[PDB]
Amino acid sequence: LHKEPATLIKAIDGDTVKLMYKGQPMTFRLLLVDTPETKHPKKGVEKYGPEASAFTKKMVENAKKIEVEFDKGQRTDKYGRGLAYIYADGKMVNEALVRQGLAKVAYTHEQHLRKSEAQAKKEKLNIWS
Amino acid sequence: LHKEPATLIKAIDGDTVKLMYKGQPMTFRLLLVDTPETKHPKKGVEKYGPEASAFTKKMVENAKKIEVEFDKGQRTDKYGRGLAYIYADGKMVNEALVRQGLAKVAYTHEQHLRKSEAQAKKEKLNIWS
Amino acid sequence: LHKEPATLIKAIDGDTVKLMYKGQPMTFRLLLVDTPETKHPKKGVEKYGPEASAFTKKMVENAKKIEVEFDKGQRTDKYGRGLAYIYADGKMVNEALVRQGLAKVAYTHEQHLRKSEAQAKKEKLNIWS
Amino acid sequence: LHKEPATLIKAIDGDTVKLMYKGQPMTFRLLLVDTPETKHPKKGVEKYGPEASAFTKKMVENAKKIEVEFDKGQRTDKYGRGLAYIYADGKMVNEALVRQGLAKVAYTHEQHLRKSEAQAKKEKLNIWS
Known about the structure:
homotetramer, alpha+beta, CATH 2.40.50.90, five-stranded mixed barrel, 26% helix, Nuclease A (chains A, B, C, D)
């Protein structure tokens, strides 16, 4: 999580955007957020999808400065879309979507994992010794 | 987050295991955890690095059944490594490491995002109508 | 239309907000936009009302700098709410609402009036002579 | 935008007429137009100011039926003046003035706002679903 400038090529849908990142075009996918579909080849457009797209679309279009929190490993999804936290003038796009009920936080095992970490810290195990 | 079998080939580090997935050799990076490394690009061998490596190796080599579970989003990194929650006889290596203080939970904006999702649910917005 | 700083006291609904304007609290109404209702004493909450409120609410809450385009005549509605164009970090709130289909532009005779003005300009009448 | 009768009392300027509205004396400021003034706070008598004043006066004094139409939003200013579209025998004084080049249409963000509303309608967003 180190911000880096990017510029908008074009907004694609609720959770994907095409940006110029490092002098090269790149389609980014919003980390940890799943918005309803609009352009998905398997199940079409879902309820609130259009509204989700419009939100993301205008958020990155009205923005003067766009930045991305894209890991040094440049992780991508199965379609080659780079995952990141996108900020429209410092406001996080993934959170803004989630807060308006236009995206759902994706299911991960983090909550469970930190539960364990706290316990290992308590017991002051190895790293936490 | 669907589980799939995989056959061990070789443990590479505390955070990386080479598996035979669907007939093809594949190297996996453990999701949501950061392990001290024996193979750090700049540092080389880190403190507790040998410990986490020995742990993953033992945990993985003594399992009868290995399984990988993928994040619906991030699936691969720029080095070609798959990203997964790996299981050794029903026990997650990711969590095993964290519990022993041999790995930390990766930084993420999930906690923040759930806070807002909870607010959205509460206010009965769009997808939560 | 000259911008002036204001600070957020609290967001009220889709089209009203309470701001500190000139060292005094003031409830502002968004000019030319009518959003569905939520807190209206005569007909309750309307469809898309909650969503409208959440939009305006977070727009002015996540904003570092808030400004208003409030006329020197300090025009108010029947409930004493001052009408203005509100900007959340330079982004106009009234337009953002309208663009997401959360507000409708209010009906005025302006389009008709400018039609006439153009004709008076053509004929280079009095002022335009 | 509902019309109501009003009885003339006295014309005050090109942009202001004192009317007897609902049994009470009320001074009205013409909506959406800016007229050169004979009674300008800083300038005093402006060019074409006498002309617009004479125009409003004649237009208003020779009408049999006067009516005021209000903006559903802005209704009063800090000086206590009501804001309205005034009609003299079915003819709007506001438009009459503009047509003769004796008044200009006030600056507004309505054109911009309709542009976006059209985009929202087209995309079938929320209220336009």
